[PDB]
Structure formats: structure tokens, C-alpha cells
């Protein structure tokens, strides 16, 4: 959803400070009659303060809408505070304030950041600069790459010297959970930027082949791997290509890290490479749906090594 | 109920300060044997302090009475505090103190004010002067007119530049809820005193015709509309006329704002206009029960515009 | 869903007898690997008997599918028995058996018939011929028109000498309930075929205007009225036109009873009349979305008569 | 456990009839003081009839023992009845009665047979001869091979023209469930004895590689495949070899069907082939723990065909 | 309520047989539009059979009415069956059938009869003639006097050779319970018609003075005493006088048994004696509200005898 | 129980300070083996501090004893604190400390004092001197008479200018509740020491005759009335006479206020007067069990005045 769904700007001391919405202000908005010319303007609920522009109505769950967010939950307040805290660390000017609020970001990424921040065991609870960094990435106000330290979080299901694999617990979220109970998604972040040894790549490919064989290793071009089940790969390709095509037309940075060729599924490496080559969605998608195998088993009988380990175990 | 049901006066510093009752003091009172000559005097429970005059026994719910108030609930304490806080903002003298306590006001209006005040999202939680203003109106110690900012509250079900429509959630109240589960009542307050455009009146009439077609738009002469179901209009007329007749005999201000003729139901506009003309209850009531239609559809096929909007939607 | 989803044929005594499926047979089917050439053939689960053709997989709710039916519920068995009982009252030959099983009918209509049949208070519990008649209509193996006596059922919310208005309680169904909680639909059946007086039409229009003002009176061309909210009229038009266009191409009877012009909403009367005239979906649909009012208030101030009745009440 | 744990013989009409134990008879037995010379004799509880020999004490769960069976459950009675019904279909003589009772059989296999028999959807509920056949196999009083029709049961998770794959729901059993919650075991039975096509073998290997990649396809020498996780293969080898070595010393039939070489895991095919060759447990076990790969992928990129199917899906 | 609220007549074999209503038939009736000329006619619900005349609408509890009966409960069916069984023991002719159905009787009396009849411990469960007798009295189709054997029932709280005192458990009733939780009423029936000794009258007056001192001993003129709290005596007088005045104008039998003067409260004996003398309600009521004491303590210090018994106890 | 059951003395600054026991110290004591010569000495639990003398074992509820107190409840701690606070307001010397601890007092009186003290509505919550006074009376370290202000508490069921009637809610107590569920006891304290008018005595006798007719008005010789049911009067006489006889032998003050002769039951006035005259228990008790009536109805037909009030009400 857009950042304008969570907060409004306030001109204080020639800079902008951002204030979370009261959820009853959003409720009043969702009932209000607004002229189309004000559909893009902040709404005044009189009783509960300023509310989001009514053009954002369907980002809010009602009886009419299950594809928005649960704005009356306390997680809405926590996410809005998280955003405001990061947006206020930037002294946003009168120029760039409309662009910042119109930015669409992942709510589920932000709820997971809040979950990290409120846990005394987590580093983000103790370093406000690290929390600031992780939020600025999730909001899209930072060219920095999400690593393990700055990850959205989840349940660690495998760790290496090089990688940490997280389970995205999006079914349990409060603000905007995944409704499809068949949803399972994982995420592999890099612990450092020191180069990763062949032995450490092998251990991660071994775990993926054994424990996540029904999953495709892909990536959206940021610095991390996304472990999705193959039934969803086609939609990931569409979402990825569309962003590629969009920000190439709007002139935004289009840096796409294809990541390790020995870890990424081959069709994904093929479809995204052709994407970077500037081809049509059709030419790229074709590469996605065709048998190519094998590219190489970059490491041989990994699955059998794990198998003999289990037999002995 | 009378304000004397919630507090007693204390002469401090040549002014009067008002103290809420302990509910066990009311319990002791309700069991006490009192001479008829003291039935109007404040009662001393010895153990729990001063209690209301025993003449107010049936304002209190017992096994004998379900038409009083739940004085042992915490909402009783909150309402009594709300009243005392407002009555103490006035430095009530030894003259006007009996008149102030004998004032009958709506408990349900006061419980809703408390509900507003305790909510951090509500303006009344943040402006003690606004809370003071809203209470002084509800108590009847202010010639000011209740607007949206000073409203008793409820659930906002429709808002305009000009109007806010509240649902009176009197079934859920703790202190003195409506017992009749068929009860539904709404309330439309004005956001400002700036004049209201024809477009904004039209939007409110449109919502009433579409969403509240089984409801009569009326008013008790204060500055707001009361959306009641027609099965209750007759009783509203009686209650309204009686107040008119009472305070015209007792010499109190009798200002009756008939409000917008295009919004009020026609029989109500007719019955109350004849009321202001000084006619009998019978002549006024007759106007209430007779087909007159139409006065005008002040705005034509409003219902059909809404209908085509829903079809497209 | 298709009748082949509930039962399979058995050649007994040169006629066909129909047998309900065991739900575990459907479960085994949903896990089975089937060649595409057998996708249309009845499946053998070995342990639990014959199962539906695997081409009908998505009529069955799984973790993959919420748009099928709850085939493991006892209502599945009751509906399958209801169908089999009716199909066995016909001595279906080897010719017409494929056509009968491929017939798509409303499951929710059948669950409601079962609800009627199992109630000792209902006439259908006591007349097996009436139950047979009502089922044969719901299955589409009868040219007879559904009346009140043969209705699917529901909660009676208004009755006349001429009409009975039913609430379709599809949210509470067990086998294939409506998932959208905003669903509300009503149905007005005719008690007889004796002509209906103007006074009795007036009473039904009066109740619809007062109690169901947010609803459009329409019909799918069978002998009864369908009371749907206007947000759904567009989809009803599509479904209706498509059936019209389909069975005009497949040569099936296309009898469309437009029903009383004074009861049906005007755009619906217009869109369906143009449908019977053989026009395009676009020309018909245009009539559906255009202000035409008024056609006539066939009975004047009906709403005001009801209103004065409530005021007196 | 031994069949003597469930019933005792009764000499009726020169043949033996078998009677289930009362569970309170077993309770009395478990408290009784018995001389070692009677430890092998049927016990008389006086109040509740005959009880098992006290030598079988640890087949019964007490506070002292969690590795026995829940003999006071109703499933104990149902299993004892199932056994008695089968043992009485044989007119067991005074000679072979001690051997029959001393037979050790799988309780969990018998509880699953009862679960099949009591289900109207199951063929075994309707054919007492089929139930008789399936029980006689589970008891070990039949040289016939367990097929799909005579299987112990469970949840069908995959079916073919040739195979049915069952999930052994041993965690939910009442009489003697598996206590280890990490337990998962599957079972593939043959639907017929007609030879199985290469296409149908391929479909089963495809499902095993995709859906059960962490599982080893093995067999205990009867006519069906056992899908166990590799952490358990070593114990299966021990149990299998021990039975091989035992009944080769006691002279019992030692028929071991190694089953399809293209379906069985290679180390299992190797370890059991060497078993049939008469080698030591050590030589056989060595084959079990050594990398050999590959034997062949008998069907190539099966996993990739399934993968592209999921991507399209 | 009227007997016509529970059943309708059917002309069978030149006599009338009475049939209980289906509760859904009453539901359909309560929603139906009926002309005023048919308001007195039996209603046809088509689906659920015949229903009561719509003029009896407010005998049925709805959301609009809490002063009717819970007709959808199973006690409604049981009471209707009880009535029908008694009305069918009379071969009611075409003449007297309207009078019988219009008879108003106590529902609570009938629910208590059902409670007696369904209890194997009760004599009425075993003698259908006694049940018939008790019902015919409660319905008002018998000149016989209700005694202990034919009583409506309740909890026996005191018994004598002469009297049985019942507690009317009307708060727990299902069909038409008393809503006022302060309700307590008792009933003293005579066990025989043999004359009652002075010792046995004394024991009953002793128990009433000790255990029910806050209660007035009265009677409605049938053969039994009614133990009501004095807060209700005034309403009993009104109800009693009204019946007296009614059936003296309609010419019905007006037999009023004042019962024992030493047991009945004196004002009640005075008010009812003056009633039998033909005086106005005012003259009679005056006697009810005036100190007269004492008439006599017919038995002296009864209360003190009981007191010394308790002290010793 | 004895005060030594709740606390032990500590010699601080040449005065004694009293410390509540830890309940686990009492538990350790109840398990300890103690020589008979130390049965009267404070016990050392080592882990939980000092415990009561083991001679007080049966004041503590165990599985062996239900006639002690629930010493592990938090009310034990609250009562022990209440006692210690009062005992420390006295600077008890080394002489009188054994006598103070051996004092037997009513636990239930003390739990009720705690209930008063912890209630913000109660005067005792606000005046530590009043709480001190009330406790010193309950402990027996004050010659002052318990009045309304210093009462143990309970539920006020009737109040006058002169009297307050309390219900002793001893069934709900936590520390040492009455186990007999038939227990009902009331208590009438005097509000002042100003003389009480005849009108105010009459009102109290009126309420007792009407509302508590099954109760005997008595007194234990302190300044208040005890409303007990007559089934208990005999035991009250015994307990009262025994105290009279005891403290006349031990030389303690024997002041017995017989209280108003017109309020006290006559046998109680007779039995206690003879007690003060120095007669035997037998002569006194005889007066208790003999009919004497009447002494006088000091106020005539009080019961009938109340009765006519209820009839009008
Ligand atoms: Cl990425
Ligand atoms: Cl108003
Ligand atoms: Cl239709
Ligand atoms: Cl096997
Ligand atoms: Cl009577
Ligand atoms: Cl006392």
C-alpha cells in the first residue's frame, strides 16, 4: 500500500513531520461523501483528526473489501509509527513530500519489522540506527541492500556462515495477512558482503534440494533469494517483469542482481537474464516454461550425501 | 434523571463544590426508613457518606425497578465525575444550587460523552475546554447549541462537509441502556455554522432516502436532526409538545429551531410549526397523522440517482 | 454443478438406476493420476466404489479450491439421495442418460429442497409426489413452473393470497454456501395460477418499496420474482442473457416470462424485453444503466400509506 | 503382540472357539501373584472370566508400561472380536491351537482393519469374505498376499491403475498408537496381479520423487512397498534381516519379494538381494550405507516434468 | 390465551377433531397481509398447514411482543396436544365449536399439567382419565372443582391430611413464563371433600403464619386457596371482581366459594363477601384497604407454638 | 482463634512489635515433630521464619481438619496485618504480651474489618484512627462498645436514624467461613449514643416482625442486637452463659447490656436477666423454653400497618 495510507505530513520548523492516523478517522472517511475533485485530498473527520485521501478506500478492509488492511488493529498503529519514525529521520522538504507518500511498499514487510523491533532478543530492539536502516530500506528511502542484519524477519529455519533462511510467517500477520492458507514462502539473506566460499554455497543448495525440493529458488533483483513454490513462479515473473518495465519507463534505477547462477533455478536465471537484455515479456516467459535440463548439477549428488547422512543418523 | 442523583454540594470557600456519591451509599439509602418530611433531604449512610434524597428512589435500578439506572456500575462513577467536573467549573452560589441539582438531563447523553472523553482518538480527550463545553450543554448549563464538535457521540455512519450522522448505540450502554431491542436512533449534527450549500443538503437527503427510508427526519428544537423510526414519531411529538407547553408555563426560553424544511419530514415540520404558532396538542397532532403528499420532492429522483450508482458499482 | 457430480448410472432391468457416490471415493479420485483420455470416465476407487469423472475435480472443495462443494458433509449425501430418488422415478434409457447427468443445476436449490423435505411441518415431508415434482423442476427434468408449493424454500418473510416471499438463507448452507457475507437474496413465488387482483399486486409492491427499498425486483424468466440488491443486477443481466444466447444456439426452449410489468423494476423489464426482441447484449445492457424515471408509479404513494400506518401503530 | 493377548480357546464340538477377554480380567491379572510355573497359563479372575497368561504382562499399558497396548479401550474389544471372528472361521484343532495363539502380529494393522470394517463406504464393510481374507493375512493364517482390496487401510494419498498409496495414521490409533510424533509412514499396495505398464510405474516413481523425496522406498518382502523416512531405514533393515534369519532357522517359508528394482531404493535392493544370497548382516548392511549412485535414473528428469507441470498449473 | 391459539377444528365423521398448529404456520401468519374482514378467519400458510386467526397476533411472542407465548418451543406443541386430546374426548358439534375455541384459559396452568403428565412418578402419567379430568377443568369444559389429584402441579412445599401446598414455578416455564423475577405464588388444594378437622385447619394456618407471613391467603372462587404476596392483592381483587361482573352480565355461572373464613385473609373475605352481595367495586375495594384487626386470631399464638418448636429443634 | 495464631512478638526498643507468620512456616510447623514440653513454644521453620506454637495445630485447616482456618489464603495475611497494626499501636510490655497473644477473638469479625478497610467507599478506608478503634474492639484490647461506625461490616439491609442492620455474609468468607449453608445471621448496631425515640424503636421492631419473623432478636451483652434464627437460640444461650460463668470465675469485667426490653425477644430477656441475677444455667434455660406470651406487643399491629402499606404499594 502507499505510505499515505498510514500518516499525513505536518509542516513543523520548515521541515515535514509525519503523524499516524487514528483508525476511527479512517472509519469516518470510509463513510464520507466526497467530491471527485477532493478524492485525492486528506480528509478531515473533525472528531478524530486527519484521515487518508479517499482515493485509498480499497486499501482498507471493510465488509465490502477483504483485500485491504485491518486498519483498526493495533498493528496498524505500530506500522504507522514505524513509518513515521523513519520518515521523520529524514527532514523531508516541501518538494519531495508528495513523492514519498505515494510510494507503495509491502505492509507485510513492515509488520515483520515491528515484530523484530519489539523483541528484546533481536538486534533491532537494541540499535535504533539498525531499525532506522531496515525501515528506510522497506519504505524505499535507501539505496542500501537488505541483508540478514536488516531483514524483515520471520522464523530462522537454516543458517550458514553466509546465509540465513527465513520463513515468512505471513499467515499469522495481524494487519494484512495472506488469506490463502496454501501460502508458504521463504527468504535467504546474506550475512555479509565478504565473498561466499564454494563450500558454503554447496551447504545452502544441499538444504534447498533436500528440505525444499518442491520450491523454486528465485529473486526479485534485490540482494536476496526468494524460495517460492513453483505454482507461483509465473506470477513472480509477471510482477518482476512489470516492475522492470515500469521503472525503465519512469526512469528509476533498474539494478537487478541475478545472484548466484548455481543457486537460482535455471529458468529463473534464464527469464531474468533475458529481462536484463531488454526482451519482450513473451520471449522471457518462454524461457521460463521450457525443459532445459540440465544446466549443470553444479554440485553432484548433494541429495545423496544428505540421504546417507540421514540413514546413519 | 436529576443531577441530584449523581452528586451533592459542598460549601467550600463561599462557593459550591460537587462530590459524587458512593454507590453503597445509594444502596443504604434504598433500604432506609425515612420520614416523609425528610424524603427531599440528602441521606447520611454513616459508612459510605452522603446519598441522594430518597425521593429519587426510582431512578435507581433494584429488583423492584428496571426503569432506573445501574448505579453500582463504574459508568455511574464516571458520569458523576463528568457532571461534578462541569458543575465545579461554575462557581455555583447558595442561590442557584437547588435549581442546578433539580435539572433533569439525559443520562445516555452523558455516558456517551464519557465514552468520547476516554478515547485518545477523540478531540474531547485532548481539549478539556471542549469537554467542558459539551458537558455544560448536556447538563443544560449553557445556551450554546450542540454541534458535531460537542456531540454526545456514537458511531459515525455518514459524514459531509456540513453534517455528521451518528448512530446512538444506546443498546450497549452500561448505566441506563435502552431495554427495547428494537430501538434504533440516529442523530445528524452540523459541522459548522457556515451556511450549507444545496449540494450538501442534497447529499444528506439522498443518504436518508436510500439508507434510512424507514426513518422519519425530525428534531426536538435544538440545533440537530433526529432520525427516528416512524413507529416512534407520535411519542416524540408528545415529548416535544409537553416540553414546549411546560417551559412556556414556567417562563423558560422556548427557542425551537425547525431546521431545514427540505430535510425534515413534512408532518413533523407541520406539527412543530403549528406548535410554535401556539395551537393545541390536538390541532398539531392532527397535522402529524394526515396524508399531505407531496409537499415537494425538493430534489427529484434522488433515490434513482443512488440506485444507478449502485448498479454500476 | 452437474448431476454427474452426485451419482452414477447402473443398468438394472433395462432401465437406469442412480447411485450416490461415497465421499471417500471422491477423495481417492481427487488424488488419482488419470490419463487425459479417461478424464471424462467414471473413476474406480476400488475401496469405496465408483467416483465422478475427474474432469469435475473443481466442483469439489479442497485446500486448492474453495469454489466447489463440501462433498464430505452429510448434506452431500442427502442431496445425492434427493437427486437419485427423482432420477429413478424416471426410467431413464441408454440414450438420454448422458444428457441427464451433464445437466448443470443449482446445488443450493437442492440443499433447500432437502431442508424442506426433512421438516415434518412442511408439505413436502408428507407428499412424496410433491417432493418428486419440486426436485424434477430443480433438476431440470420437468417443464412445470416452480410455484409456492414446489419452491426451494427458505424463511417466509411476507405472504399474500397471491405471493409468498422467501429469504434465501444461502449463507447458512452446508454443502455449497455463499461465501460473500454481504449476500442477501429473496424470492417471490406465486401461490396459484388464478389471476392476481390489483389489490394483491399493490400489497406486494407496497412491501417491496417499504421493506426492500435497496432491492431490485427482477426475474430469470421462470415463473417467479427474484429480489436482489442493485449491486448485483449487472451480473444477473449477464447470467440471464448468456443463458438466453446459449439455449437459443443449442435449440432449447427459450420461454422467458417477463412477469408483471408493475412489479418488475423498469430497467429489468426493458433489458429483458429487448432480450426477447433478439438484440445484442450491448443494446440490452444499455437499457439497464439509464435513468428512465418514471415509467409510472403504478400505485401512488404506496410508501406514504405504509408510513402513516407505522406512525399510527 | 501375540494373539493370546486378545482371546482364549474354548473346546466346543471338538473344535476350538475363541473368546475375547474382558479388560477388567486383564486388570485383575496384572495385580495377581502367580507362581512362575503358572506364568504361561491362562489366568482366572473369578469375577470377569479368563485372562491372558501373566507372561504377557508387558503387552499391557500400565503406569509401569507405556510400550504395551491400551487394553481398556473399546478398540481392544473390537480388535479381539476381529481376531476371534477370523480364528473361528478356521476350525482350529487341539494340535495347532498353541501355535496360533503364540503368533505375533501387528496390532496397528488390526486396528486399521477394524477402521475399514466399520465404515459403510469401505468394501470390507459389505463383504464378510473380504474382511475374513484381510484379517487372516494380518493374523498370519493365510499364504495370500495383501493387495489394495485386502489392505490394512489408512488415508489414500495417491492412486493409479496399478497402485494405491496409503498413509499409515498410526499417531491417531486408540489401542497401540505410535508414541513418536515424528512418525510418518506410507504404504503402496498393488491393485491387481495383472502386470504393471512402464507408464504406470513411471507415475508412481514421479509422485515419490516429487512428493516424498525425503522418503526411502523399501519393502519387508511381502507384496507391497513401504515408504519410510531414511532416518528409519537402518532399523527396517535390522527388523527385516532378523525375521529372515529367524524363520530360516525355524524352517518357516522365507519368500521375499524384492519387488520392482526401478521403484525400490538402490541400497535397499542391494541389502535385501544380498540377504536372499545368504550373506551376513554385516555384508548386507554395508551395502545399505554406501554411495552407489547412480544405479540409473530409470526414468529421466521425472522431477523436472512434474516441476514444469506445477509452473504451468 | 384463547384455545383457538393452539388448534383448529376438522369435521370428521360429523364430529369435530382438533389439530395442533405447526409453529412455522404461525410464523407465516405473523408476516402475512390480511384484510380486516379475514382477521377472524383461520389462515392458510400453504407450506405448513392452517394457522390461527390473525386477530390473535399478540398472543405470540415476536421481536415486537414479549407479552405473548413462545410458540416455537416444544412446549407449545405439548400444550396444543394436551388441549386437542381433551377437546377430542368431547364430540364437539358444529354449534358449540366456536364457543369452545374462543375460551380464554391459563397457558401456565396447561404447561404445568404437561409437566405432571410426562412424569412417571405422577398419578396423571398413569391415569388417562385423571389427566383428561384435570385438562377439562383447566380448559373450562368441566363444572368439576380442581382438587389435589387434578391440580396443575408445581413443587409440594407442605402437605396435610387435608391440604397440599404447591409452589407455582412460573419463572421456569418454557411457553409463557412470568417475566417479573419478583414473582412468587403458591396454591393450596384440598385432598378430599371429606370435612376438614379443626386440627388440620390449624396446621395449615400455622405454616402460613410462620413460613409465609409476607403472603395473603386469598382465593379466586374456585375450590382452592391462592397464597399471594400483599403487593399483588389489589390486582387480584380487580381480576376477580371483573370476572364476577363479566359473567354476571353474560349470564354464566357465578359460583364463588369464599372458603374457610379462618384461613382467608380478613380483607379478602370482606371484599369478596361484599362482591357476592352485589356491591360496587369501590365499596368492595374499600374493605380491602382498611385496618380491621383483629377479626379473631382463630387459633391463638400459633406462631409462638412453632417458635418454641424451632427453639427446641 | 487466639491472636498467637497470626503473629509473634519481637522485642524492639524495649517495646514489642508483632510480625505476621509466613503461611509456609505454618505448613512446616504442621508437619514437625515437637516434644510436648515445646508444644507451647514458637516454632522455627528455618526456611520461612517463626511459626505459631504447635499447640494451636487444629486452628489450621488441613486434610485432617476442616474446623480451623484457611491460613494459606491471602486473607490470612491481611488479617494478620490488621492485628499486628493494632497490636503495634499499643506499646505492649514484656508483662502483658503473653496475655494479649492468648486472647481468643472472632476471625470472621476480623475478615469483615479487612473487607471494610480495603473499600474506598467505607469510612474505615479513610480514617486510620477509626480502623484502629474498630480493630482494638474486635481484638478485645478496648473497653469501647462497637457501634455502627466501628462495626465489623456486612451488607446493610435496613437503616434508621438510630440503627443499622447488617447481614453477616459469613458464607462467602475466605479465611474461616461458616460451613453450614443454612447459616443466616444479622446484626443491629446503634448509630449514636443519643437516646432513641419511640418512633425509631417502632420502625426497627416493625421491620423485624415483617422481614425477619423467623428470627429471634437477642444480644451477647455488648452494645448491639443479634438477629439469629430460633433453631440457634439454645446454642447462643449456652455460649453466652458460659462466657458469663467463665469471666465471673476469672474476675474479668462482666458488663452485660440487656438492651431494649421492647426489642429483645422475651425469653432472651428473661434468660439473660436471670443470668445477671446469678442463677444456674438450668433455671435460666428454663425461662428460654417456656411459653410466656404475651409479655406485651409493645407496639400493636405493627405487622398489620406494614401489611396495608404493601397492599397499597
Ligand atoms: Cl529480491
Ligand atoms: Cl434537537
Ligand atoms: Cl425466475
Ligand atoms: Cl512388505
Ligand atoms: Cl380459586
Ligand atoms: Cl452483643
Coordinates of N, CA, C and O in Angstrom, one line a residue, chain B residues 70-151:
Chain B
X70 N -28.3 1.8 36.5 CA -27.3 0.9 37.1 C -26.3 1.7 37.9 O -25.2 1.9 37.4
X71 N -26.6 2.1 39.1 CA -25.8 3.0 39.9 C -24.6 2.3 40.5 O -23.6 3.0 40.9
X72 N -24.5 1.0 40.5 CA -23.4 0.3 41.1 C -22.3 0.0 40.0 O -21.2 -0.5 40.3
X73 N -22.6 0.4 38.7 CA -21.6 0.2 37.7 C -20.6 1.3 37.8 O -20.8 2.4 38.4
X74 N -19.4 1.1 37.2 CA -18.4 2.1 37.1 C -18.8 3.3 36.2 O -18.2 4.3 36.3
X75 N -19.7 3.1 35.3 CA -20.1 4.2 34.5 C -20.9 5.2 35.3 O -20.8 6.4 35.0
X76 N -21.5 4.8 36.4 CA -22.2 5.7 37.3 C -21.1 6.6 37.9 O -21.3 7.9 37.9
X77 N -20.0 6.1 38.3 CA -18.9 6.9 38.9 C -18.4 7.9 37.8 O -18.2 9.0 38.1
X78 N -18.2 7.3 36.6 CA -17.6 8.2 35.5 C -18.6 9.3 35.1 O -18.1 10.4 34.9
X79 N -19.9 9.0 35.1 CA -20.8 10.1 34.8 C -20.9 11.1 35.9 O -21.0 12.3 35.6
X80 N -20.9 10.6 37.1 CA -21.0 11.6 38.3 C -19.7 12.5 38.3 O -19.8 13.7 38.6
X81 N -18.6 11.9 37.9 CA -17.4 12.7 37.9 C -17.5 13.7 36.7 O -17.2 14.9 36.9
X82 N -18.0 13.3 35.6 CA -18.1 14.2 34.5 C -19.0 15.4 34.8 O -18.7 16.6 34.6
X83 N -20.2 15.1 35.5 CA -21.1 16.2 36.0 C -20.4 17.1 37.0 O -20.3 18.3 36.8
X84 N -19.8 16.5 38.0 CA -19.1 17.3 39.0 C -18.0 18.2 38.4 O -17.9 19.4 38.8
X85 N -17.2 17.7 37.5 CA -16.2 18.5 36.9 C -16.8 19.7 36.2 O -16.2 20.8 36.3
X86 N -17.9 19.5 35.5 CA -18.6 20.7 34.8 C -19.2 21.6 35.8 O -19.1 22.8 35.7
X87 N -19.9 21.1 36.8 CA -20.6 21.9 37.8 C -19.5 22.7 38.7 O -19.9 23.7 39.2
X88 N -18.3 22.1 38.8 CA -17.3 22.8 39.6 C -16.6 23.9 38.7 O -16.1 24.8 39.3
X89 N -16.6 23.8 37.4 CA -16.2 24.9 36.6 C -17.0 26.1 36.7 O -16.6 27.2 36.4
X90 N -18.3 25.9 37.2 CA -19.1 27.1 37.6 C -19.0 27.2 39.1 O -19.1 26.3 39.8
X91 N -18.8 28.5 39.5 CA -18.7 28.7 40.9 C -20.2 29.0 41.5 O -20.6 30.1 41.7
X92 N -20.9 27.9 41.6 CA -22.3 27.9 41.9 C -22.5 28.5 43.3 O -21.9 28.1 44.2
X93 N -23.4 29.5 43.4 CA -23.7 30.2 44.6 C -24.8 29.4 45.4 O -25.4 28.5 45.0
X94 N -25.0 29.9 46.6 CA -26.0 29.4 47.5 C -27.4 29.6 47.0 O -28.3 28.9 47.4
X95 N -27.6 30.4 46.0 CA -28.9 30.7 45.5 C -29.3 29.6 44.4 O -30.3 28.9 44.5
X96 N -28.5 29.5 43.4 CA -28.8 28.7 42.2 C -28.5 27.2 42.4 O -28.6 26.5 41.4
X97 N -28.1 26.8 43.6 CA -27.6 25.4 43.7 C -28.8 24.4 43.7 O -28.7 23.3 43.1
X98 N -29.9 24.8 44.3 CA -31.1 23.9 44.3 C -31.6 23.7 42.8 O -32.0 22.6 42.4
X99 N -31.6 24.8 42.1 CA -32.1 24.7 40.7 C -31.2 23.9 39.8 O -31.7 23.1 39.0
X100 N -29.9 24.0 40.0 CA -29.0 23.2 39.2 C -29.1 21.7 39.5 O -29.2 20.9 38.5
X101 N -29.3 21.3 40.7 CA -29.4 19.9 41.1 C -30.7 19.3 40.6 O -30.7 18.1 40.3
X102 N -31.8 20.1 40.6 CA -33.1 19.6 40.2 C -33.2 19.4 38.7 O -34.2 18.9 38.2
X103 N -32.2 19.8 37.9 CA -32.2 19.8 36.5 C -32.3 18.3 36.0 O -31.4 17.5 36.4
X104 N -33.2 18.0 35.2 CA -33.3 16.6 34.6 C -32.6 16.6 33.3 O -32.8 17.5 32.4
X105 N -31.6 15.7 33.1 CA -30.8 15.6 31.9 C -30.8 14.1 31.4 O -31.1 13.2 32.2
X106 N -30.4 13.9 30.2 CA -30.3 12.6 29.7 C -29.0 11.9 30.1 O -27.9 12.3 29.8
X107 N -29.2 10.8 30.9 CA -28.0 10.0 31.3 C -27.3 9.5 30.1 O -26.1 9.5 30.0
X108 N -28.1 8.9 29.2 CA -27.4 8.3 28.0 C -26.6 9.3 27.2 O -25.5 8.9 26.7
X109 N -27.0 10.6 27.2 CA -26.2 11.6 26.6 C -24.9 11.7 27.4 O -23.8 12.0 26.8
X110 N -24.9 11.6 28.7 CA -23.7 11.7 29.5 C -22.8 10.5 29.4 O -21.6 10.7 29.3
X111 N -23.3 9.3 29.4 CA -22.5 8.1 29.2 C -21.8 8.2 27.8 O -20.6 7.8 27.7
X112 N -22.4 8.7 26.8 CA -21.8 8.9 25.5 C -20.7 9.9 25.6 O -19.6 9.7 24.9
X113 N -20.9 11.0 26.3 CA -19.8 12.0 26.5 C -18.6 11.3 27.1 O -17.4 11.5 26.7
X114 N -18.8 10.6 28.2 CA -17.7 9.8 28.9 C -17.0 8.9 27.9 O -15.7 8.9 27.8
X115 N -17.7 8.2 27.0 CA -17.1 7.4 26.0 C -16.2 8.2 25.1 O -15.1 7.7 24.7
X116 N -16.7 9.4 24.7 CA -15.9 10.2 23.9 C -14.6 10.7 24.6 O -13.5 10.7 24.0
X117 N -14.8 11.1 25.9 CA -13.7 11.7 26.6 C -12.5 10.7 26.9 O -11.4 11.1 26.8
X118 N -12.8 9.4 27.1 CA -11.8 8.4 27.4 C -11.2 7.8 26.2 O -10.3 6.9 26.3
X119 N -11.5 8.3 25.0 CA -10.9 7.8 23.8 C -9.8 8.7 23.3 O -10.1 9.8 22.9
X120 N -8.5 8.3 23.3 CA -7.4 9.1 22.8 C -7.6 9.6 21.4 O -7.1 10.7 21.0
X121 N -8.4 8.9 20.5 CA -8.6 9.3 19.2 C -9.6 10.5 19.1 O -9.6 11.3 18.1
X122 N -10.4 10.8 20.1 CA -11.4 11.8 20.1 C -10.9 13.2 20.5 O -10.0 13.2 21.4
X123 N -11.4 14.2 19.9 CA -10.9 15.6 20.3 C -11.2 15.9 21.7 O -10.4 16.6 22.4
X124 N -12.3 15.4 22.3 CA -12.7 15.7 23.6 C -11.7 15.2 24.7 O -11.5 15.7 25.7
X125 N -10.9 14.1 24.3 CA -9.9 13.6 25.2 C -8.7 14.6 25.3 O -8.0 14.6 26.3
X126 N -8.6 15.5 24.3 CA -7.4 16.3 24.3 C -7.7 17.8 24.6 O -6.8 18.6 24.9
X127 N -9.0 18.2 24.5 CA -9.3 19.6 24.8 C -10.3 19.6 26.0 O -11.5 19.4 25.9
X128 N -9.8 19.9 27.2 CA -10.7 19.9 28.4 C -11.7 21.0 28.3 O -12.8 20.9 28.8
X129 N -11.4 22.1 27.5 CA -12.4 23.1 27.3 C -13.5 22.6 26.4 O -14.7 22.9 26.7
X130 N -13.2 21.8 25.4 CA -14.3 21.3 24.6 C -15.1 20.3 25.3 O -16.3 20.3 25.2
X131 N -14.5 19.4 26.1 CA -15.2 18.5 27.0 C -16.1 19.3 28.0 O -17.3 19.0 28.1
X132 N -15.6 20.4 28.6 CA -16.4 21.2 29.4 C -17.6 21.8 28.7 O -18.7 21.8 29.2
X133 N -17.3 22.3 27.4 CA -18.4 22.8 26.7 C -19.5 21.8 26.4 O -20.7 22.1 26.6
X134 N -19.1 20.6 25.9 CA -20.1 19.6 25.6 C -20.9 19.1 26.8 O -22.1 18.8 26.7
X135 N -20.2 19.1 28.0 CA -20.9 18.6 29.2 C -21.9 19.7 29.6 O -23.1 19.4 30.0
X136 N -21.5 21.0 29.6 CA -22.4 22.1 30.1 C -23.6 22.1 29.2 O -24.7 22.4 29.7
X137 N -23.5 21.7 27.9 CA -24.7 21.7 27.1 C -25.6 20.5 27.5 O -26.8 20.6 27.7
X138 N -25.0 19.3 27.7 CA -25.7 18.1 28.0 C -26.4 18.3 29.4 O -27.5 17.7 29.7
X139 N -25.8 19.0 30.3 CA -26.3 19.3 31.6 C -27.4 20.3 31.6 O -28.3 20.4 32.4
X140 N -27.4 21.2 30.5 CA -28.3 22.3 30.5 C -27.9 23.5 31.2 O -28.7 24.2 31.8
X141 N -26.6 23.7 31.3 CA -26.0 24.9 31.9 C -25.2 25.7 30.9 O -24.0 26.0 31.1
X142 N -25.8 25.8 29.7 CA -25.2 26.5 28.6 C -26.2 26.8 27.5 O -26.9 25.9 27.1
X143 N -26.3 28.0 27.0 CA -27.2 28.4 25.9 C -26.6 28.0 24.6 O -27.3 28.1 23.6
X144 N -25.4 27.4 24.5 CA -24.8 27.0 23.3 C -25.4 25.8 22.7 O -26.0 25.0 23.4
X145 N -25.4 25.7 21.4 CA -26.0 24.6 20.6 C -25.0 23.5 20.3 O -23.9 23.7 20.0
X146 N -25.5 22.3 20.6 CA -24.7 21.1 20.3 C -24.4 21.0 18.8 O -25.3 20.9 18.0
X147 N -23.1 21.0 18.4 CA -22.7 20.8 17.1 C -21.9 19.4 17.0 O -21.9 18.7 18.0
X148 N -21.3 19.2 15.9 CA -20.5 17.9 15.7 C -19.4 17.9 16.7 O -19.2 16.8 17.4
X149 N -18.7 19.0 16.9 CA -17.5 19.0 17.8 C -17.9 18.7 19.3 O -17.2 18.0 20.0
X150 N -19.1 19.1 19.7 CA -19.6 19.0 21.0 C -20.7 17.9 21.1 O -21.4 17.8 22.1
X151 N -20.8 17.0 20.1 CA -21.9 16.0 20.1 C -21.7 14.9 21.2 O -20.6 14.7 21.8

